[PDB]
C-alpha cells in the first residue's frame, strides 16, 4: 500500500562528457547516468487517480531549467528591476537533450499508460517505474515542439473546460513538421515553413475534438488578443537564437472547410533583447551568428485559451494562449505521479 507524496527527485541522462554543448555540460554536474535495463511493473487491477494540473514534478522541472539557463544563456547586458548588469555573452552550443526524472529510495513513480487519457481522473492501466521517459526541455509558446505524441486519438486537456482561465493543452497524435531557417546573407529576418496539407488536416481534427467537449459549437481560431511578443508570436529557441514567429496564417479559418493546400510560410524575427520568461526584466544577447541557421521540429501539441463572455451565441473562439512554461512540462509529465510506499 502507498500514498500520494512529494519529494525531491533526481535526474538521469545520456549527456556526453566530451560535449561543449550547454545542456550536456549542465547535466554532467547535476544528473546521473541512465539505467540500460529499466524496470517497469504493470499493476493488475489497480486504479489510481492522477491530476496533471497538480503535479510537483512540473514545478521541479522548472527550477532545474531556470538554473540551467542562469548558468549558460548569460546575456551581454542584464536589465532587471531598474539595475544594469553586464557579464559577457559568448555564443554557445544549444540543443535540448532528454532528461529523466526519478524518485529516490522509499518512493516510486506511478505511470498512467491509458490511451486517450485526458490528464485528470482514474487510470485503469497503471505501471510502476523508477524514472520517467526522456523529456527534452524545449522552451516555447503557442506550439509544443519535439514533445511526446498522443498514443491513440488527439487529446484535449484542461483542468476545467468550463473555466476560460484554465489553459487548454491540445495533445496531437501526429507530428506536423515545422521548418524554420534564417538564410545566409537584414540578418535578424527569418521564416518558418509548414506543410499546409498536413497542418490543415490536423487543425480540422482538433476542431472536431473540441466540438465533442463544447456541444458541437462552431470553432473559430483568432490571433492572440494582446501582450508581449513572446505570447502574441510563437516564440522558441533555435541553435541559441531566439525566434519570434507570426502565426496568424497557421490559424486560418478558411482552410478549415480550397486555395490553401500549398506550403505555409510564417514571417519570423530573431531578437537580441528578450523579456526573460523567468519573469523579471530584459536581457540582451549578441546578434545572431552567421550562415544558414535551421531547425526542423515536430509540433506535438498546441496551447490554447478560450474566450470568456456573457453572450448567448452558438460559437466559441480560441486563441493560442499558454501561461506558464510549466504547462509545456505538464503536457509531458501528465502521465506521471510520485507516491511514497507505506
Amino acid at each position: 500500500v502507498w500514498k500520494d507524496a512529494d519529494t525531491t527527485l533526481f535526474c538521469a541522462s545520456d549527456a556526453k562528457a566530451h560535449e561543449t554543448e550547454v545542456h550536456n555540460v549542465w547535466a554532467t554536474h547535476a544528473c546521473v547516468p541512465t539505467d540500460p535495463n529499466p524496470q517497469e511493473i504493470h499493476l493488475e487491477n489497480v486504479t489510481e487517480n492522477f491530476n496533471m494540473w497538480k503535479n510537483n514534478m512540473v514545478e521541479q522541472m522548472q527550477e532545474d531549467v531556470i538554473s540551467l539557463w542562469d548558468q549558460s544563456l548569460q546575456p551581454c547586458v542584464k536589465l532587471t528591476g531598474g539595475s544594469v548588469i553586464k557579464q559577457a555573452c559568448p555564443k554557445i552550443s544549444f540543443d535540448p537533450i532528454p532528461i529523466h526524472y526519478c524518485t529516490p529510495a522509499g518512493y516510486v513513480i506511478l505511470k498512467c499508460n491509458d490511451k486517450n487519457f485526458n490528464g485528470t481522473g482514474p487510470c485503469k492501466n497503471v505501471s510502476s517505474v523508477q524514472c520517467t521517459h526522456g523529456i527534452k526541455p524545449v522552451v516555447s509558446t503557442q506550439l509544443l515542439l519535439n514533445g511526446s505524441l498522443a498514443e491513440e486519438e488527439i487529446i484535449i486537456r484542461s483542468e476545467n473546460l468550463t473555466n476560460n482561465a484554465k489553459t487548454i493543452i491540445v495533445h496531437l497524435n501526429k507530428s506536423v513538421e515545422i521548418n524554420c531557417t534564417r538564410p545566409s546573407n537584414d540578418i535578424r529576418k527569418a521564416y518558418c515553413e509548414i506543410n499546409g496539407t498536413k497542418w490543415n488536416k490536423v487543425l480540422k481534427q482538433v476542431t472536431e475534438k473540441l466540438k465533442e467537449h463544447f456541444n458541437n459549437k462552431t470553432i473559430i481560431f483568432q490571433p492572440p488578443s494582446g501582450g508581449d511578443l513572446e505570447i502574441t508570436m510563437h516564440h522558441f529557441n533555435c541553435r541559441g537564437e531566439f525566434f519570434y514567429c507570426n502565426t496568424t496564417q497557421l490559424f486560418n479559418n478558411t482552410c478549415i472547410g480550397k486555395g490553401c493546400n500549398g506550403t505555409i510560410t510564417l514571417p519570423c524575427k530573431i531578437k537580441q533583447i528578450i523579456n526573460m520568461w523567468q519573469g523579471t526584466g530584459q536581457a540582451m544577447y549578441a546578434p545572431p551568428i552567421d550562415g544558414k541557421i535551421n531547425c526542423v521540429s515536430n509540433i506535438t501539441g498546441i496551447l490554447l485559451t478560450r474566450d470568456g463572455g456573457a453572450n448567448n451565441t452558438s460559437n466559441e473562439t480560441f486563441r493560442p494562449g499558454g501561461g506558464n512554461i510549466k504547462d509545456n512540462w505538464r503536457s509531458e509529465l501528465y502521465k506521471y505521479k510520485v507516491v511514497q510506499i507505506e
Partner: antibody
Amino acid sequence: EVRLRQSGAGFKKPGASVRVSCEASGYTFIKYYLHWIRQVPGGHPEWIGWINPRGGQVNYSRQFPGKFTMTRDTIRETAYLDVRGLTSDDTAVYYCVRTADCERDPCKGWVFPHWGQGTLVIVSP
Amino acid sequence: VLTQSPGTLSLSPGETAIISCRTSQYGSLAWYQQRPGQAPRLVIYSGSTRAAGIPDRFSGSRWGPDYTLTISNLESGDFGVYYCQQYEFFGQGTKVQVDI
C-alpha cells in the same frame, strides 16, 4: 493590505476614448491576474476581461466585440483599460478587481474580495 | 446562464431576507453586497463559505442547480442589492430595500 486605486471619473462625447488606470499595491503584483468589471446603472455586473501581469495576454469578453483594450506596467504595478467607440451603452462604472487566495505562481481565482472604488464614465452628445 | 430571483425585496429592519439564484453549470458560486454608490463587497463564496468581516446572520446554501443567500435580522447596512456570481457571469440581482 491589498489596495486597488482607480483613476478619477470623467465626461466624454459619442466617439471619444478613455483610459482608466488602476494602481495596485499591498501584494506581489505578478502573482495575481487582474479583472475588469463594468456596471451600467441598473444592470448586472458585466465582465470585460482579465490580464496576466506575467506575459500580458488578455481574455476579452465576446459580448463586447472590439470596444476595449487592456495593458499593464509590471514596474509601476498598474493596469489600464481603453474604452473606444464610446456610445450611450458605454455609460457605466468600471471596476478594477483582484482575486483572493493564492499560494500559487499564477492566480486566476474568479473569487473577488478586492475591488477598486470604480470609475464613472458618462458618454452623451 | 444564471437566473437570479426575485428582482426586489421590500422588507423591514429585523425580518429575514432570502435571495435565490439558478445555475446551468455546477461550478462554485459567490455572493456580493453592494451598498448604494459604493463598490461591491464579498460575503459568501464556494457555495456557503463566509467572507471576512461578514457576520453569521448571513448564510449561503446550495440545492440542486440552485444557490440561496439568507439574511437574518436586517441591519441598515444590509440594505442595497446582492448579486450571485459563477465564473465570469453575474445574476441580475435583487435590490434589498427597506420597507416599513
